[PDB]
């Protein structure tokens, strides 16, 4: 989707709208309503998150929580435009993206798309925690010089 | 010219008005630039590429 | 149409001594602004004291 | 020992506006009760805008009908901005009829028993012919804010526009200084809105 | 909170009209209301003092009408053999 | 003088210089070569023929 | 076998066909969400086995089996709308349903109103112009509408120019009724003829969804010379810096 | 067509050891209750099949009572003596109704209702 | 409308094909939604043909970029126009002006 700003955010987390957590995250919702019990068979969990209760947002607000995605820009040159973000869920369609983290990108907001990508098993939520985190990239790789700079 | 036709209009030459603020109720340092601008929208939207 | 959301303090996580951070929750969308900035021009001159 | 403020003149310089005045203030308070009351009043005051509308020979809001030189979208932005008081309910269905060449005013709604059109000279559309007639019906309600029609028309005859709630358009303050009283260091709040009609001035700033 | 709150304390039988309509605005089956009009039956206060015994009796009026007629009076909160005490009123007896 | 729809809202005009060409009809080229390519027109001219 | 676009469907409960007529079209004007049914269509048919009470079809309805197996074409999510108009063309020889000849009598109905509109307007213009030209020459103030108006001929006037013009107005309005006669002849068979279409295709349904998209932080607005921009956030009113006269930017 | 009720009505009595009569008065119930569900108002309805064709006749209903206070399933004495004068307060008048077309709606209903019947009768 | 435009929006206004323009002046009859009748004024008509034009507005229908190439009238009734004149504004215009 579109990229947008939103100021409010630390380096380390994004904003990510509603229906593209809704529509990622189908998996791991459906796993958590059928631990809770609230419903049965897989196709009733499909059912509810076609419906959209009231309920799977808070299902979604768990399964977000610490886990991290991977943004990326489209044009990918350097090892700096993958990196991984912890989402904070937004009402709107497009990413909130933090501005120092757009350097790295070489993204300004003249209309610019980036993709999610989600980490699913475990050892790759490690790597997006430890290796590709925003936060463990503040230098660019070519010298010594930060990436993280305010522009 | 447009120095002239904003002094027949009674609005300040430089173009600039002092603009208070909407939150802390205070004022702007620095008067700030208003007028109107004509602006398009584009239908590159945002409920087609998400 | 009267009925807003009437707001509270859910914590005050007073870090160490002689400072607080008093948290309220929830107020409209606008009225944190309108809250903080009243709360904070009294605060700054209005409240009395000795010196 | 604060000095506590009290309305003293409310100047109706127009219909629309007036110009409320508080007294007296101590030092600081003038711009604190100024953006305060000026941000209650802009955020959420009760106002009394329409949310649905049923033209008779009308399907969906994009058709049009023979005989009035406005689309019926163009019936409901102009309808969206009928200035209208209720006064003992929540709710309220108006009903309008008009036939004959010429423009549909507001003042062509066949008013109830406590609905009062505060500005009766507001057009809605203009009939066109001699034998062709709109006949709707037009319902206004109670509310707060904007509430758009995406959030919240069973049958596919009622037409729903967005609801602007509100009745203010433009609050002004302008704190000056105070020499009614000897005491000197006392401020004056002069507050100038901007009211649709729909709004007593002291009303708005005791709700606020 | 105290100072800005003690700053702000000195502000804060008739008859139903719908018995008065005419049956035709009962959105009537063209049969029902044809054989409502062959009885005399003109408002709605002319048809709900009838028993359903009484409008059985009238020619042409079949079980199907009947139920029309219940339902339609139903959605209006009327029932057939409700008493109107002074019904036609005068306002109506110089049509 | 003025049309009378240019005496509903008359455009305010800066500018110096007084026009002696005003702007032809702009599109001149899409209907000017196809009115030259299907026109009865013999000689070996038209573009059919 | 072809294909069925009645709504004689089972599985859809009544929540979804109370959208649909009587004929599986949508309604003109029905205000849909993303995932209704517009146009019902029974096709994708596999295999699907019948027990007694399914065998006993044949007896009421008359069904050997239901074709074979059970499932109306819905359509998917994304868009809101409106639906405001609805095309159904039909290949030539294929029976019309109710609807296409609903719409088959509308059309006929407007251009039949549309025809006799423009020889009632340019009637009522050639009038005009034969009561402009008997303002003078044998002028009748009050004889002229005392008789039917489609004889403003024969009235007190020599060998003119208006007679002559008066008889130029009478072939121009012959003209007009023999034209109007074939012309509506040939647009009945222009609406009530088939169309020539696809190889092995019955018929083709359009409708027309009509979105009314506003503006939410993301789209994209522009200025006149470069100065393009996403919109990051809508705010309230009260939060724009306002001047000392009281409007917000 | 015909044959196949009578063809149905042997193959369930035989596997589910089940009165004929019962699956019939079931499957009537099961009919009558899918006709209720097309008719936006609340109808009585019976259905009645034939034990040798599978044919069916559906009937809409009305109560005799002395006051109606349902016009969808009740008449007055006076209006059901007008059809039938051997009629009184707590009898039925009938009048036969379109039966509902054996789509797989009312097929799927049908056999919801036998698989009940099956059970109340596997359990007694 | 533009604020500030160039004068140049009148051309590319009326020299496409959007607007409902007029072909010989007058004076109108008949405004509506659908439809604009326009009268011919006499110093501008054929002898034969009588005439009085009208011009069928093309209302809501799609365009290939999915908007609504919608044409609104623009005229009152009784109103005069004269030969090369906007009758019916288009999608993004005003006047027989460009408004984007
Ligand atoms: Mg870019």
């Not at chain 8, 899918?34 to 108002?41: D, F, G, M, P, S």
């Amino acid at each position: 989707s579109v990229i947008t700003v939103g100021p409010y955010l630390r380096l380390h987390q994004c904003g990510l709208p509603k229906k593209m957590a809704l529509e990622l995250f189908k998996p791991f919702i459906y796993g958590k309503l059928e631990l809770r019990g609230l419903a049965t068979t897989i196709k009733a969990a499909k059912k509810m998150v076609e419906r959209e209760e009231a309920v799977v947002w808070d299902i979604l607000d768990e399964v977000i929580r610490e886990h991290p995605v991977l943004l990326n820009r489209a044009p990918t040159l350097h090892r700096l435009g993958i990196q991984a973000f912890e989402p904070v869920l937004i009402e709107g369609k497009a990413i909130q993206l933090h501005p120092l983290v757009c350097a790295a990108y070489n993204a300004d907001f003249d209309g610019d798309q980036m993709a999610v990508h989600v980490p699913l098993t475990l050892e790759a939520q490690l790597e997006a925690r430890a290796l590709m985190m925003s936060t463990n990239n503040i230098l660019s790789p070519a010298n010594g010089e930060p990436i993280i700079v305010p522009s | 010219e447009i120095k002239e036709l904003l002094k027949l209009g009674d609005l300040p030459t430089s173009g600039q008005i002092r603009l208070y603020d909407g939150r802390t109720g205070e004022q702007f340092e620095r008067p700030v630039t208003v007028g109107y601008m004509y602006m398009l929208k584009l239908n590159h939207l945002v409920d087609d590429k998400m | 149409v009267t009925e807003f959301l009437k707001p509270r303090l859910v914590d005050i996580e007073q870090v160490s001594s002689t400072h607080a951070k008093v948290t309220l929750e929830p107020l409209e969308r606008g009225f944190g602004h309108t809250l903080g900035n009243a709360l904070r021009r009294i605060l700054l001159s209005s409240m009395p004291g000795c010196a | 020992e604060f000095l506590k403020p009290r309305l003293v003149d409310i100047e109706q310089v127009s219909s629309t506006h007036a110009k409320v005045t508080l007294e007296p203030l101590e030092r600081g308070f003038g711009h604190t009760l100024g953006n305060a009351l000026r941000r209650i009043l802009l955020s959420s005051m009760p106002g009394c805008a329409v949310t649905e509308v049923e033209i008779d020979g009308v399907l969906h809001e994009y058709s049009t009908k023979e005989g009035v030189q406005e689309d019926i979208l163009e019936i409901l932005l102009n309808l969206k901005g009928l200035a209208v008081r209720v006064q003992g309910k929540d709710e309220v269905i108006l009903t309008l009829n008009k036939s004959g060449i010429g423009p549909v005013t507001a003042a062509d709604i066949t008013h109830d028993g406590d609905v009062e059109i505060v500005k009766p000279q507001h057009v809605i559309c203009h009939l066109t012919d001699e034998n062709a007639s709109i006949s709707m019906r037009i319902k206004v309600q109670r509310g707060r804010g904007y509430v758009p029609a995406s959030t919240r028309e069973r049958p596919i005859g009622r037409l729903l526009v967005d609801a602007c709630y509100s009745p203010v358009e433009r609050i002004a303050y302008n704190v000056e200084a105070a020499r009614v009283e000897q005491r000197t260091d006392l401020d004056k709040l002069v507050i100038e809105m901007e009211t649709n009609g729909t709004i007593d001035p002291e009303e708005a700033i005791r709700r606020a | 909170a105290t100072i800005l709150a003690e700053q702000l304390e000195a502000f804060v039988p008739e008859f139903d009209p719908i018995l008065l309509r005419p049956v035709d605005d009962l959105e009537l089956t063209v049969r029902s209301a044809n054989c409502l009009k062959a009885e005399a039956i003109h408002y709605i206060g002319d048809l709900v003092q009838r028993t359903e015994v009484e409008l059985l009796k009238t020619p042409n009026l079949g079980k199907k009408s009947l139920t029309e007629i219940k339902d339609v009076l139903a959605s209006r909160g009327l029932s057939l053999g409700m008493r109107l005490e002074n019904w036609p009123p005068a306002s109506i007896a110089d049509e | 003088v003025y049309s009378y729809t240019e005496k509903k809202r008359i455009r305010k005009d800066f500018g110096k210089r007084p026009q002696v060409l005003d702007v032809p009809y702009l599109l001149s080229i899409q209907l000017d070569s196809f009115q030259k390519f299907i026109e009865q027109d013999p000689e070996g001219q038209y573009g059919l023929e | 076998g072809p294909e069925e676009i009645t709504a004689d469907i089972p599985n859809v409960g009544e929540a979804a066909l109370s959208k649909l007529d009587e004929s599986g079209i949508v309604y003109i004007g029905a205000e849909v969400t993303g995932g209704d049914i517009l146009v019902g269509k029974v096709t994708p048919k596999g295999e699907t086995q019948l027990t007694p009470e399914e065998k006993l079809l044949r007896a009421i309805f008359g069904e050997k089996a239901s074709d074979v197996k059970d499932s109306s074409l819905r359509v998917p999510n994304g868009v809101s709308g409106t639906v405001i108009d609805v095309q159904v063309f039909t290949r030539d020889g294929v029976e019309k349903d109710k609807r296409a000849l609903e719409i088959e009598e509308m059309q006929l109905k407007q251009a039949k109103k549309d025809l006799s509109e423009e020889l009632q307007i340019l009637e009522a213009g050639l009038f005009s112009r034969i009561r402009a030209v008997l303002v003078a020459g044998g002028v009748e103030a009050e004889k002229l509408d005392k008789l039917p108006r489609d004889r403003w001929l024969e009235l007190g006037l020599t060998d003119e120019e208006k007679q002559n013009q008066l008889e130029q107005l009478a072939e121009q309005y012959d003209e007009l009724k023999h034209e109007f006669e074939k012309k509506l002849e040939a647009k009945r068979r222009k609406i009530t003829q088939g169309d020539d279409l696809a190889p092995g295709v019955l018929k083709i349904v359009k409708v027309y969804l009509a979105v009314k998209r506003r503006i939410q932080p993301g789209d994209k607005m522009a200025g006149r010379h470069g100065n393009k921009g996403v919109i990051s956030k809508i705010n309230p009113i009260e939060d724009m810096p306002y001047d000392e006269n009281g409007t917000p930017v | 067509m015909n044959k196949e009720i009578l063809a149905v009505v042997e193959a369930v009595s035989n596997e589910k050891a089940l009165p004929r009569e019962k699956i019939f008065e079931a499957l009537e119930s099961a009919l009558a209750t899918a006709t209720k569900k097309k008719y936006e108002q609340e109808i009585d309805v019976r259905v009645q099949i034939d034990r040798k064709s599978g044919d069916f006749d559906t009937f809409r209903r009305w109560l005799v009572v002395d006051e109606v206070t349902q016009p969808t399933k009740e008449i007055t004495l006076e209006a059901a003596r007008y059809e039938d004068e051997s009629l009184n307060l707590g009898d039925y008048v009938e009048d036969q109704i379109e039966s509902v077309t054996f789509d797989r709606i009312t097929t799927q209903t049908a056999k919801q209702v036998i698989v009940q019947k099956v059970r109340e009768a596997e359990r007694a | 409308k533009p604020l500030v435009g160039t004068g140049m929006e009148r051309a590319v206004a009326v020299d496409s094909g959007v607007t409902a323009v007029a072909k010989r002046g007058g004076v109108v009859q008949y405004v509506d939604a659908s439809r604009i009748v326009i009268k011919v004024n006499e110093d501008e008509m054929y002898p034969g043909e009588a005439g009085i034009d009208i011009y069928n507005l093309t209302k809501y229908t799609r365009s290939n970029q999915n908007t609504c190439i919608n044409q609104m009238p623009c005229v009152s009734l009784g109103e005069p126009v004269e030969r090369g004149d906007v009758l019916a504004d288009g999608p993004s215009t005003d006047l027989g002006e460009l408004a984007l």
